[PDB]
Amino acid sequence: VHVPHAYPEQQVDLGEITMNYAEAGDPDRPAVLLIPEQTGSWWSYEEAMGLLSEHFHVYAVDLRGQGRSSWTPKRYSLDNFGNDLVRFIALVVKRPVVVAGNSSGGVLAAWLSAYSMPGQLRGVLCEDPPFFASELVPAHGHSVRQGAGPVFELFRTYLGDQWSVGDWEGFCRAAGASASPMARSFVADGIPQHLQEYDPEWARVFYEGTVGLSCPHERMLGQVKTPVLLTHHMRGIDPETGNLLGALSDEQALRARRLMDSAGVTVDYESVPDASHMMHQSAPARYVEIFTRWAAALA
Amino acid sequence: PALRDVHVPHAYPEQQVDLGEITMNYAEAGDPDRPAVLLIPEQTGSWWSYEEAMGLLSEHFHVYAVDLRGQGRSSWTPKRYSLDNFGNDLVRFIALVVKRPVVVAGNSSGGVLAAWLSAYSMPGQLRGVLCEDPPFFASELVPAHGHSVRQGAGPVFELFRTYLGDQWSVGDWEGFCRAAGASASPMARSFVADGIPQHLQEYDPEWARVFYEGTVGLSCPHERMLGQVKTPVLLTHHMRGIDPETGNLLGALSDEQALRARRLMDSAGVTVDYESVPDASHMMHQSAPARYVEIFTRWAAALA
Amino acid sequence: TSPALRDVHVPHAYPEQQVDLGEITMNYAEAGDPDRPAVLLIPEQTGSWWSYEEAMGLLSEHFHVYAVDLRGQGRSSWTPKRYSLDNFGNDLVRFIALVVKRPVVVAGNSSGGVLAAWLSAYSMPGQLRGVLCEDPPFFASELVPAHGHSVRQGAGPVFELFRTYLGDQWSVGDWEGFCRAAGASASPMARSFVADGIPQHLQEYDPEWARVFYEGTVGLSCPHERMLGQVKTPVLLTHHMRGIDPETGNLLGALSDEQALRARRLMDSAGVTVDYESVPDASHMMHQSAPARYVEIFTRWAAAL
Amino acid sequence: DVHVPHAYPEQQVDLGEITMNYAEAGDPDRPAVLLIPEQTGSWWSYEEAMGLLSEHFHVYAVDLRGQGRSSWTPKRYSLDNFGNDLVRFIALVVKRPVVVAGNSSGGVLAAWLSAYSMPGQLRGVLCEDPPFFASELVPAHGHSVRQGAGPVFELFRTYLGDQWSVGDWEGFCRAAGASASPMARSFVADGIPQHLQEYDPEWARVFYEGTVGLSCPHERMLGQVKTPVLLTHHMRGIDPETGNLLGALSDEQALRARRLMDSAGVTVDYESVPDASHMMHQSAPARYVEIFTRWAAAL
């Protein structure tokens, strides 16, 4: 299923799983780790990796259940993703890292900041993170069922765990009829390449609230141990449904920022209301600029 | 309280009816020829929660006020507390005792059960329902609109579950008061008292468990309940607000949740009458009985 | 003509009618002289009222027989998000109060046999003379039973296949995918359902049924321990084929010998008369595979009542 | 607040989210061994055995999170989190291949490490009377936890409570003496045992509610082991009055565990000691140490 890409691909044995990834930049430059969004593979960062390879040693990784990394039925949880990335940092990077993650990847960047092995990290970028919005029963704001829940429901029903169903036509019919604008956005004639590399059990665990069941966001956010850059992209409310448009509300962002303040770290909050969910794709230069500014200030 | 030897006297005499699984305790007032009314109390509330309002309404109505299962002298039923079990209990009560079409008034939890009846009773049993400060969507763990119970009254339910326990099996009122006095929830700070209130002595705290854990209405989502109401609905909306410190709701339901609930009930095609009294306490039938009875009597007069 | 469209019902030997119970419409068939003792037949899961067709005939010569489609089945209402033991049971309570209007002898198969017991414990007073539980999955249909194997070691495999490949209200409807998955399954029951076309009874079936059993929500507020321990009418429990799949250890049949033992002990503690008829040579749906045997068993029992 | 003197000095190490307390015996000349206690069991559960083992092994006995002097972590008690804790401990303290040995819940974590640790971390594992499948809420084979140890877990959750928030030992004893579960009755005592004073009862909650193993089904674990295994099966039977399990796991559950582990391609040794207590390393130290040493020398 796997198509050619700009950078050569490598695979590492993290124990339970094998992780696919891709390197860029001069080795001696500072290390950067790029975590894709859900339904996103490492080559989600390609453009940005280019821009970033000028100054950093860039690693971009396929999480488990994505890309060419291992698919693990019944094993998708926040802690398993996070310890995957911890083992990657220790076995492959072998140096302190600045982590950047988009959406679910941003959630795992915060997870690393709070729960990585000591001194594994210098700072994390959380790019449009669904703090509390990706939870089934958050401590603040809307649940996943009022956010991206609908999209996940469609993935679970019509694609199935490990593409066991694979009813793409049914998926497009129901998605086009969804009141969720994001749901109606995922419609296409053929299956996008990124979804072909995606295990839809990801959707199941987010929709059903099991992925973070033992990793509540308030404790994560209250236990961060590194500087955090939080970018906050398009956001809004669908008047017809009340549902959250975007990754997280202003209220949820404020609560997350104040929890991270209680953890005693320094937070750079950059509201970019006009940016798309995946700014590293829609506007690679703007994203690399923000990241580089914040990164220079560390250590 | 766990021995259930706490019954005390009241203004009206008390009757009991076998409904099948449970026995329901209840009180009755007014001329039996008058239009029938069914009063459903709030959680932790017994029938006598309506005593005062029964004394006014009785002058114009045949009033029945009930103890739901797990409250008062009605049966306590471990592992059996769901919205459908409460509702079908009330259906059987209407069929076996009232034997007339009723107008139903419910407060908080009862108001939700009132809407339940409006949607799910046997045909013809109801002429209309009053939902008094109902936690529409705010009592669900995963509501379709707005904020979950965990961001509302879930803190107090958690205290009840941990420190009082199913059927008062723990009964650590000292630990409960200690934790309640230190809660960010003001509603929890309300319950702190030197002695256990009579209404809490008659209350089975497994109630609190099933609401806090999301099991009580798991098979009865509020979106569909409200989208299938079948009688005129009178929804009163009392004090609501936001604790600036927590972002957790104060009061029964948020403005957004009231809005979406009204939209659902209108899609059901019923006449919805929204009466907003932001200065009113949660149990207006107890704190301002005259005002409550006036509102109810005016709306009920227009029913038929 | 699609199971999702609910336009697949076919003619049958007995007249059908629908009653408004308030949330749902319940479809039902009637047979026999309306003055003879009343009887209520509850089908099995994926079973419609005409699951009893043949038995109805034999029984209608001595009983006024009602046979019902439960919600989520046949021509009764399909109610998304509303499928639970208590809702099924209260539908049947309503049906007895509104249609039969006389005390009834209830007989239910499998899931229906679990609802017969439900009624015996939780119905309105005086509604029932006795109940016949035909191969009921006591404890084996629960996700976390007090005794014996869970539904995941019983019928769960086939329920998972229904949920995944048919979907709520036939929203997925991938019959060929279901057949491929079922034929490769290690559950013999699951393999049984493979067929060239979709069987008629399954066309009338809301597979959300399967979901609520597979996920353990259908009986969450109705633990079988409490139900069985609060029966208030005489109960006849028939126990058909049962065994253990050696490759898996999973239950073959409706319930295990141990689970039937514990259920009988519970019911005996309730103070009711309990009859136990172990018929190890009988299929799960004895009322279909051996109608005359079934009617003999039922007739003796009901005449004692 | 309650820790008392023991036969060995205690050490602590920061694993990144938690602080793990532990004790050490024997010499670095000798091969590394990692002892994992049972639930409610602290490191000193192994004290006597440690002595014997220190004759020929460098021994590490650990406090798991929520036990002893290790960090208490509310809402974070999952098998994956315990397991990644022990992976971190092996990586940061032992820094050597280790022969792991765990008892009861500890045996389950030993299996977890065999299947899911970082590559090359382990040489083999001894699962001592492990509750394979019988500690799960919905096991793929045999009794569930609710027909096993679940009754005592429910008593712990209702009367001791999260982080000893309730602490009603009188009520615990009243309920335990009236328990139909004989193990529940075995926990009745005048005062609170020292091992239970260092124990966080949220442990009991997450086993009773089935959250701890939700994302770690035992069938996948056992089918993906990667080291030689030694499984010891102690006392087991059935309570006639309830049908409930006596012991860690049934004969059927042991049979299925072994079939899975053998399907994984490892060397599985099965040692049935039907007359042994649950904590044989405590009740018969020399017997336990003989069995362990006899097996570990083959590695």
Residue numbers in the entry:
A (entry chain D): 10 to 308
B (entry chain B): 5 to 308
C (entry chain A): 3 to 307
D (entry chain C): 9 to 307
Can you provide the manuscript's text about this entry?
Zearalenone (ZEN) is a mycoestrogenic polyketide produced by Fusarium graminearum and other phytopathogenic members of the genus Fusarium. ZenA cleaves zearalenone [ZEN, (S,E)-14,16-dihydroxy-3-methyl-3,4,5,6,9,10-hexahydro-1H-benzo[c]oxacyclotetradecine-1,7(8H)-dione] to hydrolyzed zearalenone [HZEN, (S,E)-2,4-dihydroxy-6-(10-hydroxy-6-oxoundec-1-en-1-yl)benzoic acid], which decarboxylates spontaneously to decarboxylated hydrolyzed zearalenone [DHZEN, (S,E)-1-(3,5-dihydroxyphenyl)-10-hydroxyundec-1-en-6-one]. Furthermore, we report site-directed mutagenesis as well as structural analysis of the dimeric ZenARe of R. erythropolis and the more thermostable, tetrameric ZenAScfl of Streptomyces coelicoflavus with and without bound ligands. The X-ray crystal structures not only revealed canonical features of α/β hydrolases with a cap domain including a Ser-His-Asp catalytic triad but also unusual features including an uncommon oxyanion hole motif and a peripheral, short antiparallel β-sheet involved in tetramer interactions.
ZenAScfl was chosen as the first crystallization target due to its greater temperature stability. For ZenAScfl, the calculated molar mass of the 6xHis-tagged monomer is 34.667 g/mol (again assuming cleavage of the N-terminal fMet), and the observed molar mass of 138 kDa indicated the presence of a tetramer. Two inter subunit interactions are responsible for tetramer formation. One is between chains A and C (equivalent to B and D) and is mediated by 18 residues forming 8 hydrogen bonds over a surface area of 350 Å2 with ΔG = +1.5 kcal mol–1, with a P-value of 0.865 [chains A/C, ΔG = −8.9 kcal mol–1, KD = 0.27 μM at 25 °C, according to Prodigy (blue)]. The other interaction, between chains A and D (B and C), involves the peripheral antiparallel β-sheet (the “flake”) and is mediated by 12 residues over an interface area of 234 Å2 with ΔG = +1.9 kcal mol–1, with a P-value of 0.805 (chains A/D ΔG = −5.8 kcal mol–1, KD = 54 μM at 25 °C, according to Prodigy, light pink). The tetrameric state of ZenAScfl may contribute to its higher thermostability compared with dimeric ZenARe, as biomolecular interactions at oligomeric interfaces can greatly affect thermostability.
